[PDB]
Amino acid sequence: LCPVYAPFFGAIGCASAIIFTSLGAAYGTAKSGVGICATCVLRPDLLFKNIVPVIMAGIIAIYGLVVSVLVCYSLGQKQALYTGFIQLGAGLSVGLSGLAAGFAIGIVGDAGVRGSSQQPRLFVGMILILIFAEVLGLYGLIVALLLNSRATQDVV
Amino acid sequence: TELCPVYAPFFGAIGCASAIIFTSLGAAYGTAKSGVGICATCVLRPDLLFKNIVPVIMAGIIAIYGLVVSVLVCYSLGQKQALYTGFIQLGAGLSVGLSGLAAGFAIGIVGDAGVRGSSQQPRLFVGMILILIFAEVLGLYGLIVALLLNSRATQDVV
Amino acid sequence: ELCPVYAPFFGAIGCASAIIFTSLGAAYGTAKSGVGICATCVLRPDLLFKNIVPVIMAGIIAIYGLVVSVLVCYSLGQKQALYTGFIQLGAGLSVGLSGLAAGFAIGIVGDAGVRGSSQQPRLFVGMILILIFAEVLGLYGLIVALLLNSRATQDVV
Amino acid sequence: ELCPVYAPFFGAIGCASAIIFTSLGAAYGTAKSGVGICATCVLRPDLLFKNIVPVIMAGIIAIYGLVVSVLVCYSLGQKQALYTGFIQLGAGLSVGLSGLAAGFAIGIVGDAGVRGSSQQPRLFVGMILILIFAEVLGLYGLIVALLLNSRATQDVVC
Amino acid sequence: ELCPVYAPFFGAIGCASAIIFTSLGAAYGTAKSGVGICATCVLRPDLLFKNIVPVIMAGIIAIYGLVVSVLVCYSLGQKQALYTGFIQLGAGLSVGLSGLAAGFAIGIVGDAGVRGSSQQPRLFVGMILILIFAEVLGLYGLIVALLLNSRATQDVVC
Amino acid sequence: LCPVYAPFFGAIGCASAIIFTSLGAAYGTAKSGVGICATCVLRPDLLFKNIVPVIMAGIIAIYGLVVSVLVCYSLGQKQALYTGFIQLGAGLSVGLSGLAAGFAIGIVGDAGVRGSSQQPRLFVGMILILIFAEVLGLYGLIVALLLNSRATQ
Amino acid sequence: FSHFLYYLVLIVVIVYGLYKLFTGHGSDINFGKFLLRTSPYMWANLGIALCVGLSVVGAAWGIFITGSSMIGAGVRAPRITTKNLISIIFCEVVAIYGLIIAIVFSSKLTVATAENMYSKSNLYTGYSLFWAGITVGASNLICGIAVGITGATAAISDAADSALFVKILVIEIFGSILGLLGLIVGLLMAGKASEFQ
Amino acid sequence: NIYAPLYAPFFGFAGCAAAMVLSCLGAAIGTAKSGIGIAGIGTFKPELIMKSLIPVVMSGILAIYGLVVAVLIAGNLSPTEDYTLFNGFMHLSCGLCVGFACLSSGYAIGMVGDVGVRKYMHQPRLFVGIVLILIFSEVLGLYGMIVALILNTRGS
Amino acid sequence: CCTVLSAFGVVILSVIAHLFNTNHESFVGSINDPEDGPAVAHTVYLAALVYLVFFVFCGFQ
Amino acid sequence: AGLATVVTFPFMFAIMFGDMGHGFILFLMALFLVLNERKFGAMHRDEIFDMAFTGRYVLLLMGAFSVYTGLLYNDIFSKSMTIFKSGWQWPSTFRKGESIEAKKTGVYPFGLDFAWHGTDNGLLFSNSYKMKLSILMGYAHMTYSFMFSYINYRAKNSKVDIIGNFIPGLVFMQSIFGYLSWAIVYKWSKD
Amino acid sequence: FYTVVGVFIVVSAMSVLFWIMAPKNNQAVWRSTVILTLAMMFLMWAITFLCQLHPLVAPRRSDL
Amino acid sequence: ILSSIWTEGLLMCLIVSALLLFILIVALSWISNLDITYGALEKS
């Protein structure tokens, strides 16, 4: 009921919470940085206005960090296999959804900062689409927190 | 025994190896891809050469992040160690490695695109550093996760 | 049980893998830098022994594998612990797949720097300065495997 | 148990690999550099016996594979230790998959060197210099395999 | 226990591989070089029989495979040692996957050699010398398999 | 003799007999319907005589439907492995045959309805080619309906 | 991504084989007992179904290869569209080969008694029908594709000049030797195989 | 009998199938790839077609090479006689070393005898060299058939 | 070229027939070798005469 | 280098091409060109036959040495020659179909022994003999052609080249592979 | 082994007797061909004699 | 017995469902490669 190979799933859930959110945040930072460093050569005044897709990418990695710390502080040697399965699910829920949120933030941020220098009114539309792209990772954060709140609830 | 079998240091050796392997892959991509941009934008602008080496220093910090966790997992290996210890040493190794790999990809892509266009506009130098900080905290987060996993490797083990 | 019959398998795979992947990385770093040299000094052959630095720094990370694949080779016994085989496999992989990355980085920076250093004469200092950061990757892998291999037979039974 | 029946399998596929993966790197170093000789000596045929040094240094690593395959072959037996089979597999892989790398490096460097040594004759001494570094990669694998094969049947029992 | 019933499987696939991969390499060496022969003897008809030497050079590889496969075939037995099957599998792979390499090398060298030898008459001796360096790889594989096959059934027992 | 896993093969044969046949019929409808839509923008009076390839692709799917219906009336909880694997063979036969025949009707049909608008003598040609590709579904239907008759004997 | 799965399955097979071999249990990966204990009706019905399936996927393959080029080549020269239908016919006969072998194989498919079910003859006639269905379906596949290619070249060389179709029909004859040779070999393989008894 | 198990004809009928399928695959590649080159010169000098049918005939001989060994494996298979596993492995090997032999020889004949026939419309002196390279590429399957016949007579 | 092959067919097959006739151990001495020596020599010597007929007929060409 | 080639090239050929049957065929088709060199000299030679007739004396030696070395081996169209007295006798009374060994009586006078022909482990002995034969003849060829470098540096009167290249080359080659070639002979000398 | 030295004496004395009695027309190819061919014939004879002087492997066959 | 997990019936369900899934992947890769000739549908 609480076997020896049970914290393997918890360690993979602690790893995958930060690994895939860092992959998503790294895709978002790379795409948005290629966008910024190609749109702020000619328009350097709106350089610090365009760093918002990179911040939205970094909040995805913060979401992964929080879940990985909370799964890390619930590991144990003699824990249940249910706890390991819930921690694996909570790691994957935030990781493979923050990866998708990072893909969306990178694509929207590149396409929005390459066209926001031409049209100044497109910035409040880019922020509005990136809010919907960052709520995609906030949903995985909520699912991971609700899973990890029940990892040790009625456990023998 | 049962809690501490014979194949338990396998996961610890893989966690000690992967933490330096994948951070060396990430740091190598961040060095090579962003050094192409240094060696391409110096044949016309050679005076900014010691300041365009920011994306190779910020990529070599990722390899130091891998080195620290590889040393700390290496000094926690034992023959009769727990299987939980090997499991979360593998977890710490993967948390540093596969996140420092992504940090190295982001540092390489952003640093190439930044030193390619920073020779044209001099005001982009303060921008590409601010983007590379967000690209390097991705590996700093994996460093924090592995340093929290490594503080539990032999804590309440039997 | 602590020293099984299949225990030298992981040590032999580590002793092979220590030199195999560093030879692949050194081969990539020598091959691309040699193409860069042989394409950059058909016009300016005075920079022939100057541009040999990427080939040397790619050849050093194969000596990094040759060190650990001798130090692992001289700790291989028939009745050795499985812990020793696991550490020797981890050490072989830690040198090999890090010197492979170091060789990739040296091979890209080497021809990208010797094709551009024929135009700008003071890109050579920057090329050396980037190749040092590309060669300390293999140095870090060497440090990790030398710290592993000093523990493979420390308190084994 | 200590010398099982399947123990000569690893010794046989270590005797086989040290010529297979060595000769299919020597073949790359011969072919990729020979298409650079046959395409260059149509205009400079006086350099024909001087540009053939990449083919010779690609043939030397196959002799490096041949020596280790013979020395692994003459240490095979029906009742040999499984340690001996593991060591012979390690020696065969150490020669083969590093002579493959040395052959890839000789093949990529050699045609770039012989196509460039006919425009500038002072690049031949640079081609030899790069090609010695490309060719010592197989000599390192031969050193590792000979130090393995000297350890193969030293203190074996049963 | 020492001469099992599934033991001739390895010798059978070793006898098969020394024809399979060797004929594959010889077929590559005949096909890719015959493309160059038929492409250059359109306007150079008198060099039609000097250019067959890549194709003959690749056929000697298949003769090398034929000899080793027949000599393995005349040592397959029903009550065969598993050591003997392992040695015959190693000797089959050592001819097959090295004759494949030598066939790749002859096929890539020989078409460039017959394309350059129609333009330069002094490149023929260089083509023959590079093809000797390419055929000696399959010769090395045959040497390894004949030294290996001679050790099958020396001290076999049970 | 009649195990618990024996109606897996019959149920998956009944599945595949309509799945692979509908994949072939969908390729034969879509690829030959692209040719109908591309042809009938410059010569629209050939619209209802070029409709024959999608009709033949539909006949293929009817041939697969027949085998799926006739397999699912012989399934039971306690059938043997003989019945199970013979229903599997009856599914695979009409599946691969309808898939092949539908691919062939799709690739011949759009080329035929494109050549029929340039040369009017190619309508009889494309019909006589598509009739050979139609009966390949019959050639799998024969083996399917023969293996159906040996289900419970 | 498919190369990643090809490498992953290979790594899992090597790790599982070496784990099973190192722990002294390497005979548990037992392909002979797998052949002895699987039902012969699987091999028999799978051989029949793959015979009639892979004959048809070669026949239909050749039919579109020499059908689409026949219709393309018939736009300028419409006097090929009936004479050259023998190239459809030569690649269509490889399906009737597989059909008349699948029915002859299914005649050998009866109900075997459970007391002699994994016997010598019942297992022999599962193996024989399996590989004699494979060697007919694959041979008719390859023959249908070869006759389709050599009919697609013939359909364009016919529209070039009328006297070339007679010369290049011979290549279709030598290509259609192959399905008849598979027809022969699949009848010789299941020639001594009895019914399931 | 422990040397003649009941799963041994699996590897004999596998030898039949590997001797037939791969040899007719090589024969089909050799006749189709070369018929492409023969029909390619159908308009340019049509009189050189009936002389150039030799790489089709030499490709068709490669199917006879597989036919002979498929008949000779299928003649040694009977459900009433004893059939050793040695015999089954030997028939698997003799079909497997003729199938890939004829496959490689058919690839070689197909790659040689269409380039040769396709360049033969320019130079009429190519034909002796074409026939010679086809003989060198057609003895590749004869080598495998010799190995298969010796191996069949050895294994029975 | 048939006269060269026929002259070698005289010489080689005559030596082989003589080595079968005298029971030489490189031709009869094994178990897999034929048992009766002169029974094989009688059918190799006739082939030597057949190749001698080919050598005489192609020697007047 | 074409004055030591005149013997060593047909002889290194014959070590690889060792057979009295194929060697006599090659010697005969070379002697056909040597005896008819006056009718073939005043003739237009195409490139392959110009190659074959320009070397009508390389092939005569390549056949004449191939007959010698295929008389050293027992290889006459891959058959043995029972010319001399054997050094191995087989047992007289033995069961049919069993594996037997031969007892050494003496040593075979000229060449390899004919009791290794239909032999299971005869190919192991031929592998050992031909491998050590190749090692010793390669050693002899290399240490013969290395003395020509000393004769060159002596004719150039350059003691600097002698002490810099020949002597450190000589006592590097002879101290390793001269020792190997001596050790093969000394293992053959002991029982 | 002394029947190898006894053949080396009669080969070496013959080669020395031919070095001084070579024809004057083509000296550097008479005393170079004949003296080197006696050396290589003696070398292959000595190698094929010493491999059978004290053998380690006995000839072993089944069919006789 | 063959195995307890990988029994005689599971391991030949996973061969049938691998052959069928192979045919499915091949056929879906055929239908995925199906493109429309857009130039014969536009005005231009």
Swiss-Prot record, chains D, E:
It holds the Pfam family ATP-synt_C. GO terms for cellular component: fungal-type vacuole membrane; Golgi membrane; membrane; proton-transporting V-type ATPase complex; vacuolar proton-transporting V-type ATPase complex; vacuolar proton-transporting V-type ATPase, V0 domain. It is a multi-pass membrane protein. GO terms for biological process: endocytosis; endosomal lumen acidification; Golgi lumen acidification; intracellular copper ion homeostasis; intracellular iron ion homeostasis; protein targeting to vacuole; proton transmembrane transport; vacuolar acidification. Residues 30-51, 111-122 are cytoplasmic. The keyword Transmembrane applies. GO terms for molecular function: proton transmembrane transporter activity; proton-transporting ATPase activity, rotational mechanism. Keywords: Hydrogen ion transport, Ion transport, Membrane, Transmembrane, Transmembrane helix, Transport, Vacuole. The chain crosses the membrane at residues 7-29, 52-72, 89-110, 123-148. It comes from the Eukaryota. Residues 1-6, 73-88, 149-158 are vacuolar. It is found in: Vacuole membrane. Its main location: membrane. The keyword Membrane applies. The record marks 135 as: Essential for proton translocation. Present with 8450 molecules/cell in log phase SD medium. V-ATPase is a heteromultimeric enzyme composed of a peripheral catalytic V1 complex (components A to H) attached to an integral membrane V0 proton pore complex (components: a, c, c', c'', d, e, f and VOA1). The decameric c-ring forms the proton-conducting pore, and is composed of eight proteolipid subunits c, one subunit c' and one subunit c''. Belongs to the V-ATPase proteolipid subunit family. The gene is VMA3.
UniProtKB/Swiss-Prot annotation, chain H:
One of its GO terms (biological process) is vacuolar acidification. Keywords: Hydrogen ion transport, Ion transport, Membrane, Transmembrane, Transmembrane helix, Transport, Vacuole. Residues 74-91, 152-156 are vacuolar. The keyword Transferase does not apply. InterPro entries: ATPase_proteolipid_c-like_dom, ATPase_proteolipid_csu, ATPase_proteolipid_su_C_euk, F/V-ATP_Csub_sf. Residues 31-52, 114-125 are cytoplasmic. It comes from the Eukaryota. GO terms for molecular function: proton-transporting ATPase activity, rotational mechanism. It is a multi-pass membrane protein. Pfam families: ATP-synt_C (PF00137). The record marks 138 as: Essential for proton translocation. The chain crosses the membrane at residues 8-30, 53-73, 92-113, 126-151. GO terms for cellular component: cell periphery; fungal-type vacuole; fungal-type vacuole membrane; Golgi membrane; membrane; proton-transporting V-type ATPase complex; vacuolar proton-transporting V-type ATPase complex; vacuolar proton-transporting V-type ATPase, V0 domain. It is found in: Vacuole membrane. Present with 538 molecules/cell in log phase SD medium. Proton-conducting pore forming subunit of the V0 complex of vacuolar(H+)-ATPase (V-ATPase), a multisubunit enzyme composed of a peripheral complex (V1) that hydrolyzes ATP and a membrane integral complex (V0) that translocates protons. V-ATPase is responsible for acidifying and maintaining the pH of intracellular compartments. Belongs to the V-ATPase proteolipid subunit family. This is V-type proton ATPase subunit c'. It comes from Saccharomyces cerevisiae (strain ATCC 204508 / S288c).
UniProtKB/Swiss-Prot annotation, chain J:
It is found in: Endosome membrane; Golgi apparatus membrane. It comes from the Eukaryota. Glycosylated. Disulfide bonds: none annotated. The chain crosses the membrane at residues 1-17, 20-36, 51-80, 129-148, 167-187. Residues 18-19, 81-128 are vacuolar. Residues 37-50, 149-166 are cytoplasmic. Present with 1084 molecules/cell in log phase SD medium. V-ATPase is a heteromultimeric enzyme composed of a peripheral catalytic V1 complex (components A to H) attached to an integral membrane V0 proton pore complex (components: a, c, c', c'', d, e, f and VOA1). Belongs to the V-ATPase 116 kDa subunit family. Subunit of the V0 complex of vacuolar(H+)-ATPase (V-ATPase), a multisubunit enzyme composed of a peripheral complex (V1) that hydrolyzes ATP and a membrane integral complex (V0) that translocates protons. V-ATPase is responsible for acidifying and maintaining the pH of intracellular compartments. Is present only in Golgi- and endosome-residing V-ATPase complexes; enzymes containing this subunit have a 4-fold lower ratio of proton transport to ATP hydrolysis than complexes containing the vacuolar isoform and do not dissociate V1 and V0 in response to glucose depletion. This is V-type proton ATPase subunit a, Golgi isoform. It comes from Saccharomyces cerevisiae (strain ATCC 204508 / S288c) (Baker's yeast). The gene is STV1.
Swiss-Prot record, chain K:
Keywords: Hydrogen ion transport, Ion transport, Membrane, Transmembrane, Transmembrane helix, Transport, Vacuole. It is a multi-pass membrane protein. It holds the Pfam family ATP_synt_H. GO terms for biological process: cell wall mannoprotein biosynthetic process; endosomal lumen acidification; Golgi lumen acidification; protein-containing complex assembly; proton transmembrane transport; transmembrane transport; vacuolar acidification. The chain crosses the membrane at residues 1-21, 33-53. It is found in: Vacuole membrane. GO terms for cellular component: fungal-type vacuole membrane; Golgi membrane; proton-transporting V-type ATPase complex; vacuolar proton-transporting V-type ATPase complex; vacuolar proton-transporting V-type ATPase, V0 domain. It comes from the Eukaryota. The keyword NADP does not apply. One of its GO terms (molecular function) is proton-transporting ATPase activity, rotational mechanism. InterPro entries: ATPase_V0-cplx_e1/e2_su. Residues 22-32 are cytoplasmic. Residues 54-64 are lumenal. Belongs to the V-ATPase e1/e2 subunit family. Subunit of the V0 complex of vacuolar(H+)-ATPase (V-ATPase), a multisubunit enzyme composed of a peripheral complex (V1) that hydrolyzes ATP and a membrane integral complex (V0) that translocates protons. V-ATPase is responsible for acidifying and maintaining the pH of intracellular compartments. V-ATPase is a heteromultimeric enzyme composed of a peripheral catalytic V1 complex (components A to H) attached to an integral membrane V0 proton pore complex (components: a, c, c', c'', d, e, f and VOA1).
